[PDB]
Coordinates of C-alpha atoms and ligand atoms in Angstrom, one line a residue:
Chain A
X1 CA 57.8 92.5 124.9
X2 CA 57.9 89.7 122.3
X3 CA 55.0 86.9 122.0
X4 CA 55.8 83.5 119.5
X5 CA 52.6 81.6 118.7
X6 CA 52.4 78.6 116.8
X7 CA 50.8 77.3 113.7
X8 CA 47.0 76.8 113.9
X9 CA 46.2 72.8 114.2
X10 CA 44.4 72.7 111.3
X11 CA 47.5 74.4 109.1
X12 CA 49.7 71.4 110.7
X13 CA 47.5 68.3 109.8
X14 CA 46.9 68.9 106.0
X15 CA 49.1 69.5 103.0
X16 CA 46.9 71.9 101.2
X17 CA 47.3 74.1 104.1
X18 CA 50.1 76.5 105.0
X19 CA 51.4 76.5 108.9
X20 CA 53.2 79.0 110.4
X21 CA 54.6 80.5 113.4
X22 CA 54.4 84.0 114.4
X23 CA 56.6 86.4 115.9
X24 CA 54.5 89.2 117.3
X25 CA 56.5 92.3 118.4
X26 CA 55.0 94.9 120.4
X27 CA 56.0 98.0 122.9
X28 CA 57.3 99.8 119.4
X29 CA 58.2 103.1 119.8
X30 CA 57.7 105.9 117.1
X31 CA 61.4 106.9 117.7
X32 CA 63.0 103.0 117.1
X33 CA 60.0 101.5 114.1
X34 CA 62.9 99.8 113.1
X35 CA 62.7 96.3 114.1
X36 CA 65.0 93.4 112.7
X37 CA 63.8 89.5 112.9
X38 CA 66.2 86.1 112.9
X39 CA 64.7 82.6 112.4
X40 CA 66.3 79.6 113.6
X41 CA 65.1 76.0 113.0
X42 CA 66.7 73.7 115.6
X43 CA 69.6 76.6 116.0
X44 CA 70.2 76.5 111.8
X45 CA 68.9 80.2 110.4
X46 CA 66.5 79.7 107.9
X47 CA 65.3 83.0 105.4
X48 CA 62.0 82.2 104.3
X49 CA 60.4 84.4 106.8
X50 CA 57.9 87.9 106.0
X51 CA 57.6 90.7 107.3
X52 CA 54.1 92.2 108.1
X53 CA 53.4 96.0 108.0
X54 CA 53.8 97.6 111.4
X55 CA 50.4 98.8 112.7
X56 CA 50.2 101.6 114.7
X57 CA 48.5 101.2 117.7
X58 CA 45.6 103.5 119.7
X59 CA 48.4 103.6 122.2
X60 CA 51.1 105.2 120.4
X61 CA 53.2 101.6 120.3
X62 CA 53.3 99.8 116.6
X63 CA 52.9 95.9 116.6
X64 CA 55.3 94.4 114.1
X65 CA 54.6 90.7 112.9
X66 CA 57.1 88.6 111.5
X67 CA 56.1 85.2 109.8
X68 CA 57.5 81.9 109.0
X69 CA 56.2 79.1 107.2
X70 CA 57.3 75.8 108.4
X71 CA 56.7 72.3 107.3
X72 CA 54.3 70.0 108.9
X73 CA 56.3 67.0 109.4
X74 CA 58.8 69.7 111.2
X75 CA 56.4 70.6 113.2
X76 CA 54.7 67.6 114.0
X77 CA 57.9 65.8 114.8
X78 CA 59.1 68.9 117.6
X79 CA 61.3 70.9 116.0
X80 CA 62.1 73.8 117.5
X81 CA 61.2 77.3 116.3
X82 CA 63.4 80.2 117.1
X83 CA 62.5 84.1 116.8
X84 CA 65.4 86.9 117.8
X85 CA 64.0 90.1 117.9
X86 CA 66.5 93.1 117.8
X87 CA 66.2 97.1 118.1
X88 CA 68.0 99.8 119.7
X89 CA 65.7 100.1 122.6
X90 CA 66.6 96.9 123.4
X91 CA 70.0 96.3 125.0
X92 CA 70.4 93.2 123.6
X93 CA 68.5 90.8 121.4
X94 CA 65.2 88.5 122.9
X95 CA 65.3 85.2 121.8
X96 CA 62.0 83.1 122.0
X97 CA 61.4 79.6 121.4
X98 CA 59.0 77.5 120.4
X99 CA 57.5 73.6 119.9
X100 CA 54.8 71.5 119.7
X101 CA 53.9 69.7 123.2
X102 CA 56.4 66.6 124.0
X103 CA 55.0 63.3 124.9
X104 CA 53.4 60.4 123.1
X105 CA 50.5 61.3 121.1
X106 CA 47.0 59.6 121.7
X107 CA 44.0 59.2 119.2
X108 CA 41.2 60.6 119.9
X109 CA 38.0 58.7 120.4
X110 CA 35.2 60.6 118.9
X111 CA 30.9 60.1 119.9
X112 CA 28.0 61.5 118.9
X113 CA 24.9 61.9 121.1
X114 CA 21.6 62.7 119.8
X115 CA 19.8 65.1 121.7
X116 CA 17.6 65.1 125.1
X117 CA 13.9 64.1 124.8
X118 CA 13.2 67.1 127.1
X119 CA 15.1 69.0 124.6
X120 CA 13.2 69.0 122.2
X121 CA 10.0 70.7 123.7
X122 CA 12.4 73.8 122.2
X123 CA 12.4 74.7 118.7
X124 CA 16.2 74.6 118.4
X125 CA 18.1 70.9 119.8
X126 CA 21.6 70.4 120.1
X127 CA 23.7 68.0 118.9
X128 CA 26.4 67.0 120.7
X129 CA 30.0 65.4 119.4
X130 CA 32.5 64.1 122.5
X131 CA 36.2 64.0 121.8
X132 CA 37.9 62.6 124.3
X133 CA 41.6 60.7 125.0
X134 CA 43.8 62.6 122.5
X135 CA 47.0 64.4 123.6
X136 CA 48.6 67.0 122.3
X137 CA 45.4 69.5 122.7
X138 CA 46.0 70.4 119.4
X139 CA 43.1 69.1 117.7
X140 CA 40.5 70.7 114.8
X141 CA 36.7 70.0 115.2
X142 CA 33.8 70.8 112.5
X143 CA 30.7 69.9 111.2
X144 CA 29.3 69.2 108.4
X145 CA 25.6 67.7 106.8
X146 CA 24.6 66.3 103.6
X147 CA 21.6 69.3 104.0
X148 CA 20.9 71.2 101.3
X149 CA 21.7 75.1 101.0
X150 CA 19.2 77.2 102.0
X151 CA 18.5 74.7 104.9
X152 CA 21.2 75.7 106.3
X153 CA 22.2 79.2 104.3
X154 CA 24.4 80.6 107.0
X155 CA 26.1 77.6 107.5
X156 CA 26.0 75.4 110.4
X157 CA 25.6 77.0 114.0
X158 CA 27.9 75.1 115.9
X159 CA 30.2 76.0 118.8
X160 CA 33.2 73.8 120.5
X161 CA 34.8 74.1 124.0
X162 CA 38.6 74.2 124.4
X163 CA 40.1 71.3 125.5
X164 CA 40.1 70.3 129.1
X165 CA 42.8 68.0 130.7
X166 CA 41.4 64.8 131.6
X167 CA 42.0 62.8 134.8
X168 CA 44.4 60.6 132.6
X169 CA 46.7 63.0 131.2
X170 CA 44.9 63.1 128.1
X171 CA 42.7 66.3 126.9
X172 CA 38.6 65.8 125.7
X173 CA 36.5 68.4 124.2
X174 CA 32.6 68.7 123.2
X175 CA 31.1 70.2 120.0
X176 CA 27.9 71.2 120.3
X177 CA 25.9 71.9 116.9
X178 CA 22.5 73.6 117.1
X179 CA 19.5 72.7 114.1
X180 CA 16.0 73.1 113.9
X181 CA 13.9 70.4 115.6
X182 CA 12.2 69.8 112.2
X183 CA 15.9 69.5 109.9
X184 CA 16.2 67.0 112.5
X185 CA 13.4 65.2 112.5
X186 CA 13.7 65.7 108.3
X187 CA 16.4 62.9 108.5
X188 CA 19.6 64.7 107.7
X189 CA 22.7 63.3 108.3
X190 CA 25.1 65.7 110.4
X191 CA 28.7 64.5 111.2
X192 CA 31.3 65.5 113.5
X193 CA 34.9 65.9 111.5
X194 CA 37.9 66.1 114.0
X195 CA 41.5 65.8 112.2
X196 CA 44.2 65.5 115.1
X197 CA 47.8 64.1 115.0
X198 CA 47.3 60.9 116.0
X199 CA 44.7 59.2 113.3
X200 CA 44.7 57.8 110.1
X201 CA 44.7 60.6 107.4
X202 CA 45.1 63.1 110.4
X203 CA 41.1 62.9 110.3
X204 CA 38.3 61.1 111.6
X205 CA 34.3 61.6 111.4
X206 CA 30.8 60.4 113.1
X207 CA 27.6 61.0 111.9
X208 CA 24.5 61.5 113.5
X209 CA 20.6 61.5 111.9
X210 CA 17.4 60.9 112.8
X211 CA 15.5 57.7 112.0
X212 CA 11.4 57.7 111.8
Chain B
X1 CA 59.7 98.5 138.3
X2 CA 55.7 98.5 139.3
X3 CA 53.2 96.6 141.3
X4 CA 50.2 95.2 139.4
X5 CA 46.9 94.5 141.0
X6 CA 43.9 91.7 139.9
X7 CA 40.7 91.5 141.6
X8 CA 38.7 88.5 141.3
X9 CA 35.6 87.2 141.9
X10 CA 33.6 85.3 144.7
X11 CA 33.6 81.3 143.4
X12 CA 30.0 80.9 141.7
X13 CA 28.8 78.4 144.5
X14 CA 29.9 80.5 147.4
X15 CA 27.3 83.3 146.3
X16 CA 24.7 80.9 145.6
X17 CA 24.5 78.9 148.8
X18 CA 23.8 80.9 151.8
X19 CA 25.8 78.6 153.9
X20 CA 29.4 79.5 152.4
X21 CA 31.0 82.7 152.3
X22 CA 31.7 84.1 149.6
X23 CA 34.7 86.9 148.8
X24 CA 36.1 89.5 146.8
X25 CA 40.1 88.5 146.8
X26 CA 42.2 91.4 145.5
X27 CA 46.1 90.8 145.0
X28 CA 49.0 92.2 144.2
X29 CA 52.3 91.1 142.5
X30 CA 55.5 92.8 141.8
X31 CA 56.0 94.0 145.5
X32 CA 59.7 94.1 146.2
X33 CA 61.5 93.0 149.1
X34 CA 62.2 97.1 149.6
X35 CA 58.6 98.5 150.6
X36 CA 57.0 95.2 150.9
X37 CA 54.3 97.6 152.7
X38 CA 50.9 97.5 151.3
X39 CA 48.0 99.7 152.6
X40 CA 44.4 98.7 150.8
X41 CA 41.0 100.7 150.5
X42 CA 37.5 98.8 150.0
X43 CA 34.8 100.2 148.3
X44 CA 31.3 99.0 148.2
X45 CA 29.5 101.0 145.9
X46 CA 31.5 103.9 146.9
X47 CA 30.9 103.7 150.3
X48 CA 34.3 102.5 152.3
X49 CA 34.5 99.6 154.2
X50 CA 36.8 98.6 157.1
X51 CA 35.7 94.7 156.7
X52 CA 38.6 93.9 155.1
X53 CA 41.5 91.0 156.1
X54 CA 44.9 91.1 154.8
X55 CA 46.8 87.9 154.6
X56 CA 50.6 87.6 155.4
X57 CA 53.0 88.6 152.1
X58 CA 53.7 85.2 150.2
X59 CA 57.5 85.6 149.0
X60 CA 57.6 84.5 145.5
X61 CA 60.1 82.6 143.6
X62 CA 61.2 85.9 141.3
X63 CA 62.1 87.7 144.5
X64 CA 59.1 89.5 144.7
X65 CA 55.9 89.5 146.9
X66 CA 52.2 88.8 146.7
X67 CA 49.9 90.6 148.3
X68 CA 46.4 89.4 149.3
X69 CA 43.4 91.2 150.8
X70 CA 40.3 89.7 150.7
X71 CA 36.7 91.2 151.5
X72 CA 33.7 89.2 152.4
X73 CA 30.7 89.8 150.4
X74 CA 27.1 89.5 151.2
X75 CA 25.0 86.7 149.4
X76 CA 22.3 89.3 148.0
X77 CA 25.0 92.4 147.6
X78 CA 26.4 90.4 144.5
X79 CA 23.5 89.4 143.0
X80 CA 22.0 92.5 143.0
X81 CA 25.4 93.8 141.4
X82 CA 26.9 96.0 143.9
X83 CA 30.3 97.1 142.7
X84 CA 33.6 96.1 144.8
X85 CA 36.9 98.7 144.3
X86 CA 40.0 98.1 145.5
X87 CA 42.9 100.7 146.1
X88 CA 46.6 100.0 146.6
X89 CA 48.6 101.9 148.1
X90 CA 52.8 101.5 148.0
X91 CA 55.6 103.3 148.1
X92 CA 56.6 102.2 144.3
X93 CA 53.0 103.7 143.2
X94 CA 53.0 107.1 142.1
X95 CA 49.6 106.8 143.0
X96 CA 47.0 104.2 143.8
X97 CA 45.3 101.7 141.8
X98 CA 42.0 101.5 141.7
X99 CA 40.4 98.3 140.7
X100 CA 36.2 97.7 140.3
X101 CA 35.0 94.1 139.7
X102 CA 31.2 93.3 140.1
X103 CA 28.6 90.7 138.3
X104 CA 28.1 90.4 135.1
X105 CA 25.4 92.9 133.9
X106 CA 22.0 91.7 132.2
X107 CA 19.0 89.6 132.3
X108 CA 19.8 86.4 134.0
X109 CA 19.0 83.5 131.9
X110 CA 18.0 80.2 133.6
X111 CA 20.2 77.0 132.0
X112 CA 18.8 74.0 130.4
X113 CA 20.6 70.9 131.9
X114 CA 20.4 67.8 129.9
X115 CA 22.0 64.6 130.6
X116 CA 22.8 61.7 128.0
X117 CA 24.0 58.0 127.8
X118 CA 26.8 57.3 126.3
X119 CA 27.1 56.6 123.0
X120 CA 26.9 53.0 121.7
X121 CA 30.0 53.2 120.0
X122 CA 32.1 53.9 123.8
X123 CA 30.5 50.7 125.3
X124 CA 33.8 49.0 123.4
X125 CA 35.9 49.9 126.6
X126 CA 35.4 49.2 130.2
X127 CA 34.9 53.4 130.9
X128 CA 31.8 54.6 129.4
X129 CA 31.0 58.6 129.7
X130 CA 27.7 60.4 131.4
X131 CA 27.5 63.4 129.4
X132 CA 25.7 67.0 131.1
X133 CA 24.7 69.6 128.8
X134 CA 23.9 73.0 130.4
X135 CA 22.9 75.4 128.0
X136 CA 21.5 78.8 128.0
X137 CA 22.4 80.4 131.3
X138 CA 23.5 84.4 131.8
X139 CA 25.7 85.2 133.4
X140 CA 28.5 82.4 133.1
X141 CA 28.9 82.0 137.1
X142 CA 27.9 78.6 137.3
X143 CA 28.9 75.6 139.6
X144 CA 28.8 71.8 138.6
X145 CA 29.0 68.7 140.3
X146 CA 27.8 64.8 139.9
X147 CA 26.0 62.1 142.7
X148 CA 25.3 58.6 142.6
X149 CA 23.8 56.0 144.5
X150 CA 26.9 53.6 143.6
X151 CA 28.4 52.0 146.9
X152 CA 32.1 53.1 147.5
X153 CA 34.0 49.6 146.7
X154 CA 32.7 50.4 143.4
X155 CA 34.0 54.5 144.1
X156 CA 36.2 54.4 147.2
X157 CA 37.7 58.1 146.0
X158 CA 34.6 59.3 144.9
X159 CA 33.2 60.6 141.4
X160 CA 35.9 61.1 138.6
X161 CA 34.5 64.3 136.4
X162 CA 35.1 67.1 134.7
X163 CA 33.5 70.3 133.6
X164 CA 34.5 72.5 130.5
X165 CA 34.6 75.8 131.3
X166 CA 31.8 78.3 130.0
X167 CA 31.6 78.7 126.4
X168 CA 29.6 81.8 124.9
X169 CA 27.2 80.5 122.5
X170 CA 25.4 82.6 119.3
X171 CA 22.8 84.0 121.2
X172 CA 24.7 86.0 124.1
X173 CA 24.5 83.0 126.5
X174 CA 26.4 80.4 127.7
X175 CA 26.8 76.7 127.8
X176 CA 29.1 73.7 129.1
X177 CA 29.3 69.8 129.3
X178 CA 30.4 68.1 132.1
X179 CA 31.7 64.9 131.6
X180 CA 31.5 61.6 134.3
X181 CA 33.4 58.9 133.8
X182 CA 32.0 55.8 135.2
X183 CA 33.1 51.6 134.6
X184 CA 30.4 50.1 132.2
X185 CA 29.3 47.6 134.7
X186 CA 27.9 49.7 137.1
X187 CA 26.4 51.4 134.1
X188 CA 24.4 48.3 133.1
X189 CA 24.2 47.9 136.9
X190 CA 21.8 50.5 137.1
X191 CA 23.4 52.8 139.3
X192 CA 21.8 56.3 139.0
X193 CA 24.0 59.4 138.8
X194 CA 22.8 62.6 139.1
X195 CA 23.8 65.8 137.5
X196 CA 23.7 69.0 140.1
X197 CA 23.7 72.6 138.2
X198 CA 23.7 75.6 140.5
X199 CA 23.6 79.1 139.0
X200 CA 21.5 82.0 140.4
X201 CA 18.5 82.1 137.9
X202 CA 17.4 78.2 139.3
X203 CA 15.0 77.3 141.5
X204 CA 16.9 77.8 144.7
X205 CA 19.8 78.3 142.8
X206 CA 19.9 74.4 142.4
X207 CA 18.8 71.9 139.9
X208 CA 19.5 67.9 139.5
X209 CA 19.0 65.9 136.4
X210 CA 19.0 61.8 136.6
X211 CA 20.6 59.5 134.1
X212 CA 20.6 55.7 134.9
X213 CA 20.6 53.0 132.1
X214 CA 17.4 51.9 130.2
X215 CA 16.4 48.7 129.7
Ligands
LIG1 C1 56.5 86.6 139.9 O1 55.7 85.5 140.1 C2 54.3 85.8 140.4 C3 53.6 84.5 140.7 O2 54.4 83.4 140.4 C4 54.2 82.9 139.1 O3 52.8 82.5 138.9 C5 52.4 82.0 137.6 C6 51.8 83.1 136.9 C7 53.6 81.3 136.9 O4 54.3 82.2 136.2 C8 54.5 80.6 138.0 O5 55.5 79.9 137.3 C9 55.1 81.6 138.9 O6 55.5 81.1 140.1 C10 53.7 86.5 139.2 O7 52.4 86.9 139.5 C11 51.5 86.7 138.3 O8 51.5 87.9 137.6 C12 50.7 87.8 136.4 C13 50.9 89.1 135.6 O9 52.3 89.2 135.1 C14 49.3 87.5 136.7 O10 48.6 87.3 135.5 C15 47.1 87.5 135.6 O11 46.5 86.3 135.9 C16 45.1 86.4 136.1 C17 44.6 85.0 136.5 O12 44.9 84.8 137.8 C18 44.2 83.7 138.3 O13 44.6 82.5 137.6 C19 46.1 82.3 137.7 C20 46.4 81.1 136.8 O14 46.8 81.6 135.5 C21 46.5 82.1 139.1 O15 47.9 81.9 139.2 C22 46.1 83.3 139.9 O16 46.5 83.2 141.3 C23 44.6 83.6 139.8 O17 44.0 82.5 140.4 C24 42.7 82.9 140.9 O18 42.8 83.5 142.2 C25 41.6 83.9 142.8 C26 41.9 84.6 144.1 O19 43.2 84.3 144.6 C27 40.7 82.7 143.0 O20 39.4 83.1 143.5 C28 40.4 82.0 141.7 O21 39.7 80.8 141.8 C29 41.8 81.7 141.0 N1 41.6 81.2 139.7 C30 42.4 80.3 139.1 C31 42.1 79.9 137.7 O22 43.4 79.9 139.6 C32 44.4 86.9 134.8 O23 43.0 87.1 135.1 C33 45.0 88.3 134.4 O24 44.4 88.7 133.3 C34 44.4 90.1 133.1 O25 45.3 90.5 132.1 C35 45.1 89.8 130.9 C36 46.3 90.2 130.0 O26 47.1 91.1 130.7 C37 43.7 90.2 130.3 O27 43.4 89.5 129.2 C38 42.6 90.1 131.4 O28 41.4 90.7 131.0 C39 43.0 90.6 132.8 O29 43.0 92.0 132.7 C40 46.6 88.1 134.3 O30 46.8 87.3 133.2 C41 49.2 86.3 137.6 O31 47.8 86.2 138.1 C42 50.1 86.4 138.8 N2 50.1 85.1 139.5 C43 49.8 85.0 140.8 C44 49.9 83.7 141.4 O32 49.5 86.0 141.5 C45 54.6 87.8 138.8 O33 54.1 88.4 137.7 C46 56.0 87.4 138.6 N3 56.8 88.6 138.4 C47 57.7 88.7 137.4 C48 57.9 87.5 136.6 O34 58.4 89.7 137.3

């Protein structure tokens, strides 16, 4: 069985970063470890691809990975990504393919809502960022605050849902980040960072502080 | 060649309302057209149960059939955690499968549902969002739903929502937002909308939280 994923939003969105896709290989048996990969961008081969280590499994199958770094504005603009798998236990090569979603991409609105007054009877209060009216799904939400260090020394406690599709065709998602009652009270300023496709810079961000 | 088998879960508010019936639904795929026979075993708790119901063989666009029996479930056996087992039985099995599927196990935790105005910032366009936070529950069956007070010219099809599915949060429980999406008019027009929560460590397994705009 073969599974292609694709690059991770954030890798797409910024040059600094490095996307890739990645051919996972699995069902490997100890007598047939050997295991041959072919890369095709839009049908032309392309050789910059790595092959992983094969890790054995507690099953007695390996899993054999098989990399390729692409370029954003490839990705971003739907190229298609190509992964052809072959090995004796296989009669005859498998072939999987793989793009970013089609249609016209939307820009996300992005809100931040303070929290509940009958929140805050709790020691810890959530702060809540919407994203809402972006397509594709593939979007990258953080948060960040001007606080300092040992504030907040394990970093910010924050989770995010995974995008749901809206009534409209479009996808939303909220953030919601956790703090202390009294860091919130303190003033600091906490902002909601989302870099997706469709905005300027491939980023966005809303703050959110008290005020006394 | 093999059959597979999934069992799933009663929907959260079947359990929690003693009025609907919640159900155990076990199926299975990869049933051929040769031996499309399918013979199931219930277990409560290791105890077998004839209560069973079997629903015709759906035939499935990759030539193969589905499989569905479903069990109905007491109210109180789920919440107390019984365990549900399923056996198939087929000619393409070498044996049966055996499938268990009960409630989550654990303390339940009771959620803390919080609604909020939209921000200032989404007032620019004429569909403003009612935001729900639910927070804090164990286990993640949980149901969601919105009411108003708004007259149906305004809403001739109803509410237009929707809920994010459970997200585990740092400290072993869960959380979601629900999101209703409402025109800014009848926003400012006062219209209250209400945020329903039902999970089985509430009051009644039911809660309601108000939002209406503040003058
Ligand atoms: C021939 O076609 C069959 C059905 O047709 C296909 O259906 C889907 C899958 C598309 O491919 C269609 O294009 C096509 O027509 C296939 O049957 C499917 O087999 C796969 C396994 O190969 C099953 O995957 C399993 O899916 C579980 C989730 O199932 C719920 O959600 C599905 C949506 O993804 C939905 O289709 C299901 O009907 C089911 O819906 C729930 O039903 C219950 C009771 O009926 C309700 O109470 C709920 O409300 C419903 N909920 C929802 C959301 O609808 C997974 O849970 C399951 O996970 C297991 O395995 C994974 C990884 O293996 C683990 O991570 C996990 O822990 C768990 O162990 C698994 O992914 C799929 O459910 C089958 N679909 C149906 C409709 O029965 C045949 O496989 C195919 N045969 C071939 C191609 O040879």
């Amino acid at each position: 069985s073969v599974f292609l994923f694709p690059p991770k939003p954030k890798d797409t969105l910024m040059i600094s970063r490095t996307p890739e896709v990645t051919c996972v290989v699995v069902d490997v048996s100890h007598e047939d470890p050997e295991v041959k990969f072919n890369w095709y961008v839009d049908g032309v081969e392309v050789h910059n691809a790595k092959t992983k280590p094969r890790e054995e499994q507690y099953n007695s199958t390996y899993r054999v990975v098989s990399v390729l770094t692409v370029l954003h504005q490839d990705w971003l603009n739907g190229k298609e990504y190509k992964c052809k798998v072959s090995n004796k236990a296989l009669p005859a090569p498998i072939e999987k393919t793989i793009s970013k979603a089609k249609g016209q991409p939307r820009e996300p609105q992005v809100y931040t809502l303070p929290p509940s007054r009958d929140e805050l009877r709790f020691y810890q209060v959530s702060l809540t960022c919407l994203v809402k009216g972006f397509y594709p799904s593939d979007i990258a939400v953080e948060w960040e605050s001007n606080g300092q260090p040992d504030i907040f020394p394990n970093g910010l406690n924050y989770k995010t849902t995974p995008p749901v599709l809206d009534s409209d065709g479009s996808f939303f998602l909220y953030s919601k980040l956790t703090v202390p009652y009294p860091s919130w009270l303190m003033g600091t300023r906490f902002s909601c960072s989302v870099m997706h496709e469709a905005l300027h810079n491939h980023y966005t961000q809303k703050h959110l502080e008290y005020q006394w």
